[PDB]
A paper describes a structure:
Here, we present a fluorescence-based, genetically encoded AGM biosensor, consisting of an AGM binding-domain derived from the putrescine periplasmic binding-protein (PBP) PotF from *E. coli* fused to a super-folder circularly permuted GFP (sfcpGFP). In the sensor the large conformational change of the PBP upon ligand binding is transmitted to the fluorescent protein by altering the chromophore environment and thus triggering a change in signal. We chose PotF due to its promiscuous binding of biogenic amines characterized in prior studies. Previously, we identified AGM as a natural ligand (K_D_ = 0.22 µM) for the periplasmic binding-protein PotF.
Author numbering: 27 to 369
């Protein structure tokens, strides 16, 4: 008799405009849907406990770090009859963080690559600018030429150091402290005078408006920037590269806090997300690949056929995933990132 409620916490710009409304119309459940613009906000609230959320959207990486902390509770697959729709390849990658896929429902995934302005890069570096390579943004001679049109990096040491280590021919997940303080920091300090800022969201609208011409960014965010520029009929042409040397893949997942009050409603929402049209519609709006293999044909051609959103087998084989480091490396990385950004 009483109203059924559900509290969700997700990234901004990571659902379709009508997803929640459609769910409410179909199920009668009241949804309170809150958003963050950085996962540091989510992670800080989960670690503090008693969030009031029934569903949250962490990284598979963070989820691994909190598996022993009891932040999350295992998902009851009997309430998720469309679980069979999830792509088995992605389930296996997520399971590196969540054995036997016990706690997390893969949601969307993408890569950390290069977002850029096509016209500005070709004006500055020529028609043969190496947009297919990390050389575009990790060679100082190129960044010096791009300095004035604006360069940004993510403010994310784990991802940036891993990208740098892969580029140098080191283990992207090296456990050697000297790899970070030595060769990775050396390259970063060479590049640093040419970097306008380190920020993990300002780069989206700056790419869309023409204010930055190259950025390390998350694929779907860059594709959103490209679409925003198109809708603004502003002439700006943004693209994204998964470079030929490889790149980091990441997997955002739905998970259920251990103190969730509205569990039946949360399962209804997850099984709704597993219906192929629901997550295909989300992908159509947010320009991220969903993790549902049944959904892929339903995604619009512009999105499904974009190999920087849905990469093919050869590109997938070049992606690496982040591993959890020992605390001693975590601290070396954080210390070194502060040095890089300082100067
Ligand atoms: N960095 C992640 N793990 N996800 C980024 C998602 C952003 C959706 N607007
Ligand atoms: Ca991840």
């Amino acid at each position: 008799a009483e109203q059924k409620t559900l509290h969700i916490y997700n990234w901004s710009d990571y659902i379709a405009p009508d997803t929640v409304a459609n769910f409410e119309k179909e199920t009668g459940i009241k949804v309170v849907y809150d958003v963050f613009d950085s996962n540091e906000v989510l992670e800080g609230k989960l670690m503090a406990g008693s969030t009031g959320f029934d569903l949250v959207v962490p990284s598979a990486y963070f989820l691994e770090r909190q598996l022993t902390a009891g932040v999350f509770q295992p998902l009851d697959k009997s309430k998720l009859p469309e679980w069979k729709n999830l792509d088995p390849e992605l389930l296996k990658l997520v399971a590196k963080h969540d054995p036997d896929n016990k706690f997390a429902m893969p949601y969307m995934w993408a890569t950390t690559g290069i977002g850029y302005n096509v016209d500005k890069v070709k004006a500055v570096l020529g028609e043969n600018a190496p947009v297919d390579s990390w050389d575009l943004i990790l060679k100082p001679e190129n960044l010096e030429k791009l300095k004035s049109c604006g360069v940004s990096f993510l403010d994310d040491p784990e991802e940036v150091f891993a990208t740098v280590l892969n580029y140098l021919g080191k283990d992207p997940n090296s456990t050697k402290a000297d790899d970070y303080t030595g060769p990775a920091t050396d390259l970063l300090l060479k590049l640093r005078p040419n970097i306008r800022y380190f920020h993990s969201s300002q780069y989206i609208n700056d790419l869309a408006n023409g204010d930055i011409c190259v950025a390390i960014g998350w694929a779907g965010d860059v594709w959103q920037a490209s679409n925003r520029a198109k809708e603004a009929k502003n002439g700006v042409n943004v693209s994204f590269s998964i470079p030929k040397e490889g790149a980091m893949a990441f997997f955002d997942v739905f998970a259920m806090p251990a103190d969730a009050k509205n569990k039946d409603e949360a399962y209804q929402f997850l099984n709704y997300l597993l219906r192929p049209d629901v997550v295909a519609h989300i992908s159509d709006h947010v320009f991220y690949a969903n993790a549902n293999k049944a959904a892929t044909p339903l995604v619009s051609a512009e999105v499904r056929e974009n190999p920087g959103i849905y990469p093919p087998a050869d590109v997938r084989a070049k992606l690496f995933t982040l591993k959890v480091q020992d605390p001693k490396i975590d601290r070396v990385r954080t210390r070194a990132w502060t040095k890089v950004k300082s100067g």
